[PDB]
């Protein structure tokens, strides 16, 4: 029967109704989809349901109806009311009302799982196994039970090649799958999933999805999953809502809702052609090996010869763990290669760059900007400080405000949105507003070579087309060369021109994005 | 209530120590080093990339119910869960504006959740990485607590706090993290605080003139301001010593009548 | 400005925008520019100021014909600006001087 109700709740943040008139009902087992634009309020609503600090309602309330042991503090599924405890006592049914200091809240909060958006809730130094082992031990199980699960689990998110590998040294989506496998292994009453797949490539996303079903839908644990990327909302949820700017634009069967949402949408802007101009970078036998006396060699880049031709947009597509981030860090002179040559044609001289110093790598590093896949801002500074004063803008402070506003507008914010966003902290933004702010922070210094590790990933098709036309305009009006690591194919077709495929540290073949597509499929 | 005095004394050195200890005293800033430049000199993380984590965020981890523990608000870097990093400073005895015990006392009086350590030629403060970067930029580097000549952000090999200054008035550095650029008159960090070279040298500004260094220093010197000119501090030190002696002998009110 | 030698000094316009007119700097005398006379309240009109070593553009001189409570005559905040003097008698020529042109000053104490 019924798990939680949502009364008429209007969440506001200082004359900012992030959410208003939100109400839905769930039962013991069902998947609920939360579909909407970027900044619609999905992360706020999931932190709202989780009961995190600062997400208390101003108008309404939500009721959690659970089972409970008054001698054991175990919360359970409401369906357990009528069954026999794992202790003495039988059970008792509670209408825990969150934000009402209702004791059970603590136990219930322990019984609910959350997949945070772009935040890896892992111990870092506790490898992969101990991280998942922790989840089991923490939640309960036992030596054998844990072991069985641990192994059965590492199989589901596909991590048998990284078992003893330190989770701090993992790679993006691998950490995402690690956090996921930690998140099933607690027996929740509810699994709130914020962008559960992440900027994950089709294939790995499919494994994550099946793993989710294989587990949460088997234990009839209700699912609240957001993706403003529909194809999952359909393949996972049966009842989904569509909200727009915090207001439920629709509440229906997931199929109809996804249809309606996708109609609201736009196609790409297929820009005009561009001719490129000479080779700028030349990498010859670039290798990057991570040797351990305790886990083996991880040949991240295994011999890679690439060339970029100056004003051009270069793509790097592949599967998770192929070596794209390691390659992009080698290009940006962040991570030195174990072996191999890299020369950057500053203007006509090719500086040997596996040599640190202003006399050598520095020369080209003034005009190299990198947006990292695991990006960050300065949370103690404002957005305006982040664009202008945190990195060092070569202009007086009076005239930096309109420069930052122009950069935010060029990224794809409106004038009102960029004006309202300037006097704000990064914690007050959404994941996708922070991503665009970090992209603007890379772009505002106007470097020559720009590396963009997954610019998209949390952008509605519309926001993505926006960031896209941005890169295209800046490349032509400013002859900026770009290197793009991406998973969205249509972004590569309508943006890139000479993408390359990476598979296990190799380059396989380089060519047109359509040619890359027919090589992939 | 109680109005907090911070340090006894009438001299300029005691006034500077009181100003450093005072959390309501706004330290005068003398340079602008950007946040990413401070991160680059710190050498812990690449600027623009996310902070490495040591544990899940405090909402994700489940703790026992503790009323006294939950009364204290954690730091933001503790809320998200970040590794604890350090920033280390060496201070010359020749009129450096900040001094190691003064640095430790001011850090523990002004900052939350910090780990201060004091040596003769070393002073280190440890905190969560985001908060540590915040007060490294806001207080430690750009204000009158820092002078690029007589002080320096340095780990690894530290030596030269008691040595004489060089021809440019800078503290001796065995690894030469910061050099003097005579064309601009500024000190530039060519290496980070531990010693690996930087790809782009970072301007930490120009050396403070010696006349200002006499006014803003917190050390007592015969050629500057000596403790013989500040008898109030010596009397307080002697009173503390006598009170410790009397408490260690017999800790009663009648034995403290001879205080 | 050259008033150490002659009775009339020369200021060169370096950058101009509406109310602001910034003058050229000398990267040979701007060494000990410690923050000296920093504003406490809103800066009034016709105030000459030099940015101290705190800001990146240390030594640049400027003046604005209006008043604001946030930024000094050179586009920097108050902690990065030290007031050196003011324009007393002759005005309405800072709004009709192009970039690169030299204006001449006379000290009236």
């Amino acid at each position: 029967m019924l798990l939680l109700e949502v009364k008429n709740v209007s969440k506001s943040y200082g004359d900012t109704e992030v959410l208003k008139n939100v109400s839905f009902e769930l039962n013991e087992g069902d998947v609920m989809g939360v579909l909407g634009r970027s900044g619609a309020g999905k992360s706020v609503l999931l932190h709202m349901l989780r009961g995190m600090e600062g997400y208390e309602p101003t108008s309404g309330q939500i009721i959690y109806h659970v089972a409970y042991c008054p001698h054991c503090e175990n919360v359970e599924a409401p369906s357990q009311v009528g069954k026999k405890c794992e202790c003495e006592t039988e059970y008792v049914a509670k209408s825990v009302d969150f934000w009402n200091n209702n004791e059970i809240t603590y136990a219930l909060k322990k019984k609910i799982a959350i997949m945070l958006q772009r935040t890896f809730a892992l111990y870092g130094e506790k490898t992969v196994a101990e991280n998942i082992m922790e989840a089991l031990t923490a939640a309960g199980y036992e030596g054998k039970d844990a072991t069985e699960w641990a192994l059965n689990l590492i199989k589901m998110v596909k991590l048998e090649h990284r078992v003893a590998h330190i989770s701090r040294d993992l790679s993006g989506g691998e950490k995402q799958r690690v956090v996921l496998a930690r998140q099933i292994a607690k027996n929740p009453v509810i699994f709130l999933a914020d962008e559960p797949t992440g900027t994950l490539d089709p294939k790995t996303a499919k494994f994550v999805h099946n793993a989710l079903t294989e587990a949460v839908i088997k234990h009839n644990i209700a699912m609240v999953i957001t993706s403003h990327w529909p194809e999952v909302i359909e393949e996972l949820c049966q009842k989904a809502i569509w909200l727009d700017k915090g207001e439920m634009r629709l509440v229906g069967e997931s199929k109809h809702v996804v249809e309606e949402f996708m109609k609201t949408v736009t196609s790409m802007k297929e820009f005009e052609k561009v001719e490129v101009k000479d080779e700028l970078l030349k990498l010859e036998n670039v290798e990057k090996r991570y040797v351990s006396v305790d886990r083996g060699i991880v040949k991240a880049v295994d011999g890679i010869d690439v060339s970029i031709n100056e004003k051009e947009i270069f793509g790097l597509v592949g599967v998770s763990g192929a070596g794209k981030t390691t390659l992009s860090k080698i290009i940006a002179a962040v991570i030195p290669p174990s072996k191999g040559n890299y020369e950057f044609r500053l203007a006509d001289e090719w500086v040997d760059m596996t040599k640190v110093g202003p006399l050598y790598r520095g020369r080209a590093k003034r005009y190299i900007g990198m947006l990292f896949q695991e990006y960050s801002l300065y949370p103690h500074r404002t957005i305006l400080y982040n664009l202008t004063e945190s990195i060092g803008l070569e202009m007086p402070g009076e005239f930096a405000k309109m420069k930052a506003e122009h950069t935010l507008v060029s990224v794809g914010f409106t004038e009102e949105e960029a004006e309202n966003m300037l006097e704000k902290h990064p914690s007050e933004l959404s994941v996708g507003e922070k991503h665009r702010v970090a992209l603007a922070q890379v772009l505002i210094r106007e470097p020559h070579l720009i590396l963009l590790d997954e610019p998209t990933g949390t952008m509605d098709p519309i926001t993505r087309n926006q960031v896209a036309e941005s890169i295209q305009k800046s490349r032509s009006e400013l002859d900026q060369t770009y290197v793009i690591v991406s998973h969205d194919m249509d972004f590569v077709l309508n943006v890139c021109d000479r993408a390359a495929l990476v598979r296990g540290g190799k380059i396989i073949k380089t060519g047109k994005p359509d040619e890359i597509v027919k090589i992939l499929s | 209530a109680y109005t907090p005095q911070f340090y006894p004394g009438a001299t300029k050195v005691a006034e500077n120590r009181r100003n450093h200890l005072n959390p309501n005293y706004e330290l005068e800033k003398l340079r602008e080093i950007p946040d990413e430049d401070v991160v680059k000199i710190m050498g812990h993380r690449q600027p623009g990339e996310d902070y490495k984590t040591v544990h899940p965020p405090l909402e994700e981890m489940d703790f026992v119910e503790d009323y006294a523990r939950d009364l204290v608000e954690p730091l933001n870097g503790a809320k998200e869960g970040h590794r604890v990093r350090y920033i280390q400073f060496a201070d010359s005895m020749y009129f450096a504006p900040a001094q190691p015990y003064d640095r430790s006392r001011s850090y523990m009086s002004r900052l939350r959740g910090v780990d201060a350590g004091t040596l003769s030629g070393r002073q280190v403060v440890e905190c969560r990485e985001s908060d540590l970067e915040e007060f490294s930029k806001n207080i430690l580097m750009d204000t009158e607590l820092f002078d690029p000549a007589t002080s320096g952000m340095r780990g690894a090999t530290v030596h030269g706090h008691s040595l004489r200054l060089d021809e440019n008035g800078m503290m001796f550095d065995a690894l030469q993290r910061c050099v003097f650029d005579e064309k601009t008159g500024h000190v530039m960090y060519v290496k980070d605080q531990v010693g690996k070279p930087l790809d782009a040298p970072v301007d930490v500004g120009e050396p403070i003139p010696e006349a200002k260094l006499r006014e803003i220093t917190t050390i007592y010197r015969n050629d500057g301001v000596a403790m013989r000119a500040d008898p109030d501090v010596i009397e307080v030190v002697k009173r503390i010593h006598r009170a410790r002696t009397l408490g260690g002998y017999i800790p009663t009110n009648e034995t403290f009548k001879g205080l | 400005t050259g008033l150490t030698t002659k009775r009339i000094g020369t200021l060169k316009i370096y950058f101009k925008h509406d109310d602001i007119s910034m003058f050229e700097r000398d990267w040979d005398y701007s060494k000990g520019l410690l923050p000296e006379n920093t504003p406490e309240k809103s800066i009034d009109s016709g105030i000459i100021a030099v940015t101290n070593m705190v800001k990146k553009y240390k030594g640049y001189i400027g003046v604005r014909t209006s008043s604001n409570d946030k930024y000094g005559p050179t586009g920097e905040t108050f902690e990065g600006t030290n007031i050196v003097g003011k324009v007393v008698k002759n005005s309405e020529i800072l709004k009709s001087v192009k970039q690169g042109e030299n204006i001449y000053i006379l000290e009236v104490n």
């Binding site: 202003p358 006399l359 520095g362 020369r363 003034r366 070569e394 202009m395 007086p396 005239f399 420069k403 122009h406 106007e446 | 050099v179 650029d181 005579e182 064309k183 601009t184 530039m188 060519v190 782009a200 040298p201 301007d203 | 370096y14 950058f15 925008h17 990146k56 553009y57």
Partner: peptide, 25 residues
């Protein structure tokens, strides 16, 4: 914009020009 280009040309502290000790010879 014209003002953005004017600011970029007028206030470009080039590290090679300002710090010739390191980026040159």
């Amino acid at each position: 914009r014209l003002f953005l280009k004017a600011l970029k040309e007028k206030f470009e502290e080039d590290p090679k020009e300002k710090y010739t000790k390191f980026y040159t010879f």
